[PDB]
Design a protein around this ligand. Structure first.
Ligand SMILES: *[C@@H]1O[C@H](CO)[C@@H](O)[C@H](O)[C@H]1NC(C)=O
Lengths: 49, 142
């Protein structure tokens, strides 16, 4: 779509592999750096999608 | 003993699996179930049990898989002792497939528990393409 087709998504923050043939719905915000974030849209707290 | 629930967190943030034989048909639902902290179908009138609290999942949200098959043969009413029925199941999750194998043997009597010495193989019952990962399972009862 020339006007913007954002309906297709992908995941890039898991830090874990996958076995064959499964889907995973991890809506929760991934935390990196071993410091409890406990917030939304913070530094080193990125949305997984 | 009627059904089972399978998951990894079981708090409406991960994909969950439920299997129930209590109903008129065998029902398998892979859904985003929000199980409340009281997974009971037994607390009823003073000596009887009914099919109450059929909404143990407080929320059934955006979710995918549903399946209905014919019921499995149980007994009737309630008895103390003389447990002729014996049921065996094995549940596996391999290569993205959920495999359930079943076996049922009637007419067993003995005063102690903890199974006899029997050589009984298990026939395959169902293979399902649920496509999730599971870490903890909890038995259901009525
Ligand atoms: C289900 O659809 C709603 C509608 O916007 C959305 O908010 C939610 O994230 C969806 N959930 C899943 C597991 O797809």
């Amino acid at each position: 779509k020339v006007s913007g087709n954002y309906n297709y998504l992908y995941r890039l923050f898991r830090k874990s592999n996958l076995k064959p043939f499964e889907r995973d719905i991890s809506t929760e915000i991934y935390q990196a750096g071993n410091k409890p974030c406990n917030g939304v849209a913070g530094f080193n707290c990125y949305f997984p999608l | 003993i009627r059904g089972w629930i399978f998951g990894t967190t079981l708090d409406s943030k991960t994909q969950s699996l439920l299997i129930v034989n209590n109903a008129t048909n065998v029902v398998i639902k892979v859904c985003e179930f929000q199980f409340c902290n009281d997974p009971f179908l037994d607390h009823k009138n003073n000596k009887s049990w009914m099919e109450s609290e059929f909404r143990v999942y407080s929320s059934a949200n955006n979710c995918t898989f549903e399946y209905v098959s014919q019921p499995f043969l149980m007994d009737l009413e309630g008895k103390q002792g003389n447990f002729k029925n014996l049921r065996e199941f094995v549940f596996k999750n391999i290569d993205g497939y959920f495999k359930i194998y079943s076996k049922h043997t009637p007419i067993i009597v003995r005063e102690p528990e903890d199974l006899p010495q029997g050589f009984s193989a298990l026939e395959p019952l169902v293979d399902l393409p649920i496509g999730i990962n599971i870490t903890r399972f909890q038995t259901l009862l009525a």
